[PDB]
Design an enzyme around this catalytic site. Structure first.
Site, PDB file in Angstrom:
ATOM      1  N   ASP A  28      -0.098 -15.789  -4.084  1.00 17.05           N
ATOM      2  CA  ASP A  28       0.984 -15.319  -3.232  1.00 17.05           C
ATOM      3  C   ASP A  28       2.011 -14.594  -4.089  1.00 17.05           C
ATOM      4  O   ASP A  28       2.701 -15.243  -4.890  1.00 17.05           O
ATOM      5  CB  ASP A  28       1.629 -16.492  -2.501  1.00 17.05           C
ATOM      6  CG  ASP A  28       2.545 -16.056  -1.369  1.00 17.05           C
ATOM      7  OD1 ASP A  28       2.849 -14.851  -1.264  1.00 17.05           O
ATOM      8  OD2 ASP A  28       2.961 -16.929  -0.576  1.00 17.05           O
ATOM      9  N   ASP A  60      -3.831   1.851  16.402  1.00 14.67           N
ATOM     10  CA  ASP A  60      -4.379   0.506  16.493  1.00 14.67           C
ATOM     11  C   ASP A  60      -5.792   0.576  17.050  1.00 14.67           C
ATOM     12  O   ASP A  60      -6.004   1.086  18.156  1.00 14.67           O
ATOM     13  CB  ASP A  60      -3.507  -0.392  17.373  1.00 14.67           C
ATOM     14  CG  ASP A  60      -3.955  -1.845  17.353  1.00 14.67           C
ATOM     15  OD1 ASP A  60      -4.967  -2.157  16.699  1.00 14.67           O
ATOM     16  OD2 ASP A  60      -3.298  -2.687  17.993  1.00 14.67           O
TER      17      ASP A  60
END
EC number: 3.6.-.-
Length: 638
Positions: free
Chosen positions: A370, A49
């Site tokens: 989507d 991260d």
């Protein structure tokens, strides 16, 4: 016991924790690291991260590039923060001119302008996260820091990539041993020396460390996965499909955890918590820097989940009616784009906007990018495929709208395959390399992070044509629940990359005695970009929730997208519980949990996607930022 099995042997076991969407996945793989270190295991916990999640979630500067031992506990624990963009690409990184007299000097200086050397030096995309976990296995079998009894991984939210980079390395590895013995000018086109044996000798080992990865996930002895998901319905069947993969590719998955469950006793504390979030965020929505000029709308949370065509028409009066629908004013055409991370039900808004000014006298196409069949579930009609479809549910009446769904992964491969179709023979004319470079020319069209959908958008920009140019007046987009929104001006330089290559190929096409195929891509993006900085006809909408974190994030992107130039004129705050019926909100979300727990408990039995082994994690009422808090949160869950 649930935990006892995870700490059974001194036989090194790698714990993997995979999930999606801020489930506290960091906060529970951290707990597991601590409560394992309490059991005696010299343990390493690692996160890929760049936000340095492992650090804020440990309260130590554990975010160094190598494994760092923590200060302040007699407890044996190591954290590792690995830099994807820097470290991984770091291991990656006579004069006989007589051709000039054959006039070859014009053709050779046009091929070196293709700079195919660069295209070989461009390390393939995905490399970093591919080699991340291989770097982890270095320090542990190296043991320079300590013998590690177990390793706990915070994986990036939701194996194909190690084979993709395995394949992109071979394509580049296959070409360099073809160039080790080569004519001096052929190497000149790549800038490569005589002896290639120094570079391939290390290009292969990087290819082998990607392969040990694929061999680790399969490794039935060391590896084990654990899924982590918030009790929502979508989250369960999203995890259902995750396990499908883990059973195919042989990866042992023995446990699922559900975090952010409301307990029965302390469920009444949740609402006191949830509220102060909404209070703080709205105080900021009112006061945030740069939110001043754009218009703002507060929507009270979903009564019952909007799955109908009539339902969508009443939602239209909630968001755009008591507050101003004076968006409809302007020229004859309007481009409305709505975006936000997944969870805000922006599709319920996005859909409700087309319906609202459908019967207002306006014909309006709603485009959904989507791939999860939002529009097919939002109007309840299975609007499938790319071509427009009519909308049939209402009582007999005027419906001037339609909705098309573009898979963005399908719109990308739709595009890459077009480029499969003389100059080939010339490169192949020294040795056969056309197959390699064509595919490697595409190694420079996957680099972009969120482009698959921009393809889907520019496809329908150009659909302005007599078949539709007359049919639709206003259109409204439904971006996918990701980071579509690009706030830095990479438009002109992704566009120049196209010119840079559509001008470089015109330089070698005129020398061999097509590119207007890239001219179609050149004007279409420029036709898309034309409707992005359109101030009169085009404006934007960003949908968000009162969770204060997700709110400032919606300004973090608002203020940056502003000076980018794109007219972003409205923000929507779609899910706002209200206190007079605070009791019903608790009573509802409590059910939405155990109602969805039923859907997981009823998963085909134990065959594949499973009811394998469940871990319920109570609601994160406190910050778990302290190392002791994790010891506490860890004995609660494990």
């Amino acid at each position: 016991g649930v935990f006892e099995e995870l700490a059974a042997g001194q036989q090194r076991k790698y714990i993997m924790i995979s999930g999606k969407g801020g489930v506290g996945k960091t906060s529970l793989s951290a707990s597991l690291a601590v409560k394992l270190a309490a059991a005696g295991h010299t343990t390493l916990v690692v996160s890929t991260d760049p936000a340095h999640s492992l650090s804020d979630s440990l309260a130590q500067d554990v975010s160094g590039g190598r494994p760092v031992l923590l200060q302040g506990t007699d407890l044996p624990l190591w954290g590792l923060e690995i830099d994807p963009e820097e470290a991984k690409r770091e291991f990656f990184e006579q004069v006989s001119d007589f051709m000039n007299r054959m006039g070859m000097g014009f053709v050779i200086d046009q091929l070196k302008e293709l700079k195919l050397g660069e295209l070989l030096n461009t390390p393939p995309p995905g490399l970093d996260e591919a080699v991340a976990i291989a770097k982890v296995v270095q320090f542990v079998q190296a043991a320079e820091y300590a013998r590690f009894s177990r390793i706990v991984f915070d994986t990036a939210p939701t194996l194909a990539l190690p084979d993709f980079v395995d394949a992109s390395l071979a394509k580049v590895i296959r070409l360099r041993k073809k160039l080790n013995g080569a004519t001096s000018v052929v190497r000149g086109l790549f800038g490569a020396g005589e002896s290639q044996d120094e570079a391939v000798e290390k290009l292969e080992l990087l290819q082998q460390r990607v392969r040990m990865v694929k061999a680790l996930f399969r490794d039935k002895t060391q590896t084990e996965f654990i899924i982590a998901t918030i009790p929502t319905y979508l989250g369960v069947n999203e995890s259902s499909r995750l396990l499908q993969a883990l059973r195919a590719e042989q990866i042992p998955c023995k446990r699922i955890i559900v975090n952010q469950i409301v307990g029965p006793q302390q469920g009444d504390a949740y609402l006191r918590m949830k509220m102060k979030d909404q209070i703080a965020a709205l105080e900021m929505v009112a006061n945030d820097p740069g939110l001043r000029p754009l218009r703002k709308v507060i929507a009270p949370m979903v009564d019952v989940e909007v799955r109908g065509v009539p339902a969508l028409s009443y939602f239209g009066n909630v968001v755009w009616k008591d507050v101003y629908d004076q968006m409809n004013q302007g020229a004859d055409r309007k481009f409305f784009l709505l975006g936000g991370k997944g969870g805000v039900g922006k599709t319920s808004c996005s859909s409700s906007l087309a319906v609202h000014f459908a019967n207002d006298g306006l014909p309006t196409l709603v485009v959904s990018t989507d791939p999860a069949h939002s529009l097919s579930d939002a109007f309840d009609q299975d609007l499938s495929g790319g071509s427009p479809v009519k909308i049939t549910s209402p009582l007999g009446d005027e419906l001037p709208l339609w909705g098309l769904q573009l898979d963005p992964e399908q719109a990308k491969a739709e595009l890459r395959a077009v480029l499969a179709d003389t100059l080939d023979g010339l490169g192949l004319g020294v040795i056969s390399d056309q197959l390699k470079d064509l595919q490697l020319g595409e190694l420079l069209d996957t680099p972009p992070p969120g482009v698959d959908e921009a393809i889907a958008i520019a496809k329908v920009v150009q659909f302005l044509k007599a078949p539709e140019y007359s049919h639709f007046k206003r259109i409204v987009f439904d971006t996918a629940p990701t980071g579509h929104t690009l706030r830095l001006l990479s438009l002109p330089d992704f566009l120049d990359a196209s010119i840079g290559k559509l001008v470089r190929l015109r330089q070698k096409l005129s020398a061999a005695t097509a590119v207007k195929r890239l001219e179609a891509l050149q004007a279409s993006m420029e036709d898309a970009k034309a409707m992005f900085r359109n101030q009169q006809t085009t404006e934007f909408i960003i949908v968000t929730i009162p969770t204060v974190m997700a709110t400032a994030e919606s300004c973090r992107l608002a203020s940056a997208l502003q000076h980018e130039g794109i007219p972003l004129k409205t923000i929507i705050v779609n899910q706002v519980v209200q206190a007079n019926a605070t009791d019903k909100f608790l009573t509802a979300r409590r059910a939405d949990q155990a109602r969805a727990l039923h859907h997981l408990e009823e998963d085909t039995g134990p065959d594949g996607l499973a009811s394998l082994q469940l871990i319920k994690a109570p609601l994160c009422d406190l910050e778990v930022r302290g190392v002791p808090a994790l010891s506490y949160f860890g004995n609660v869950v494990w």
